[PDB]
């Protein structure tokens, strides 16, 4: 039901270096799908 | 935290076979593109193969094409190499390494020199006993 | 109509630091990509750096990483190349040149040789006085 | 079904040279592995040399070192043994035999005695003054 705008632009020049910028972490394991407009921060081990 | 240990190696003979295995103690496979590197003594480290993060996209080098192969299994969380038709000048210290995301042949960017973030201890492989 | 002026250079010791300018007389920058080229005495001309039309894109040549930094500003209408930690073979005549559109590593095409359309006069720079 | 025919021999003197040829009619060389075996009177049969299926990988015995060269030609389907610097104790009868697969030196197996599938009649090589 989203009323708003999405703005995106390429940033290869402040967020990337030769050894690799590793300050951006993208979580790929979670127990269940998130509610709308919700975050989880806690660092606990995910066993498959 | 994330260590990449190797199992295999030893003394073999030309025309023989041997198996390499790299089990990731840290982050899993099928999410990081892993690769393999070798070091001839007195010579610089050059990679031999990769497998991508997604599916089974496979690359080799020119001098090792057809003879050697790569495969992985996600349940054991390891990558496997089958050495076939071993010859004299392959005597090298073999390393396994990894990097997040598909990095081997990614656009106009092949797996040139050493760009992976993780490193392994390495095992020795010798031939012609 | 379009003329590129180069100002700077001089007689300095090795390991010094300089500052060189590239002023466009006609068409403006930040809509047209520009770069730097030099010509050693007795050697065919070859580029140094190349910056795109938009944003802050920056490339160098294989022997000049970590020594030169390149920047631009629209208010003063001038392109600045900063020279740091110079040595013996850097003595050449440096030319600045510009092209429409992002030609600096566009697809599978770098800024190889001299394909640029606009040209400038240049300034001789020497070292080891 | 498949026969092997040998050619060469004669009356060689110490210091001379000779060349034996073994021609296969039915089976294919460079996919088969052939070898040479010799038998002296009053003794037991012992191999001379072998070459495997893959490429021209040569193998040799302890008393055969440096004097006897083995080569395979796939055009005439005939393997050649070149005898250089023959000594007086080298008088024997020579047999060529073929065995499919890369049979010689496959792990913990040398080409000891005779278990080869295909045989021949043999040619007598005598050496004396």
Curated annotation (Swiss-Prot), chain A:
Residues 21-29 are annotated as: Immunodominant HLA epitope recognized by the CD8+. It comes from the Viruses. Attaches the virion to the cell membrane by interacting with host receptor, initiating the infection. The major receptor is host ACE2. When S2/S2' has been cleaved, binding to the receptor triggers direct fusion at the cell membrane. When S2/S2' has not been cleaved, binding to the receptor results in internalization of the virus by endocytosis using host TFRC and GRM2 and leading to fusion of the virion membrane with the host endosomal membrane. Alternatively, may use NRP1/NRP2 and integrin as entry receptors. Binds to host ACE2. RBD also interacts with the N-linked glycan on 'Asn-90' of ACE2. Cleavage of S generates a polybasic C-terminal sequence on S1 that binds to host Neuropilin-1 (NRP1) and Neuropilin-2 (NRP2) receptors. Interacts with host integrin alpha-5/beta-1 (ITGA5:ITGB1) and with ACE2 in complex with integrin alpha-5/beta-1 (ITGA5:ITGB1). May interact via cytoplasmic c-terminus with M protein. May interact (via N-terminus) with host bilirubin and biliverdin, thereby preventing antibody binding to the SARS-CoV-2 spike NTD via an allosteric mechanism. This is Spike protein S1. The lineage of its organism: Viruses, Riboviria, Orthornavirae, Pisuviricota, Pisoniviricetes.
């Amino acid at each position: 039901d989203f009323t708003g705008c999405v703005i995106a632009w390429n940033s290869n020049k402040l967020d990337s270096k030769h050894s690799g910028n590793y300050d951006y972490w993208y979580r790929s394991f979670r127990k269940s799908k998130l509610k709308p407009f919700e975050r989880d921060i806690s660092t606990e081990i995910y066993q498959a | 935290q994330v260590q990449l240990q190797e199992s295999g190696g030893g003394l073999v003979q030309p025309g023989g076979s041997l198996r390499l295995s790299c089990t990731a103690s840290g982050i899993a496979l099928h999410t990081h593109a892993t690769g393999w590197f070798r070091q001839a003594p007195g010579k610089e480290r050059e990679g031999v193969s990769c497998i991508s993060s997604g599916d089974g996209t496979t690359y080799y080098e020119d001098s090792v094409e057809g003879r050697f192969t790569i495969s992985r299994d996600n349940a054991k969380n390891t990558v496997y190499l089958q050495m076939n038709s071993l010859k004299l000048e392959d005597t090298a210290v073999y390393y396994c390494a990894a990097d997040p995301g598909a990095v081997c042949h990614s656009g106009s960017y092949y797996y040139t020199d050493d760009d992976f973030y993780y490193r392994g201890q390495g095992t020795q492989v010798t031939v012609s006993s």
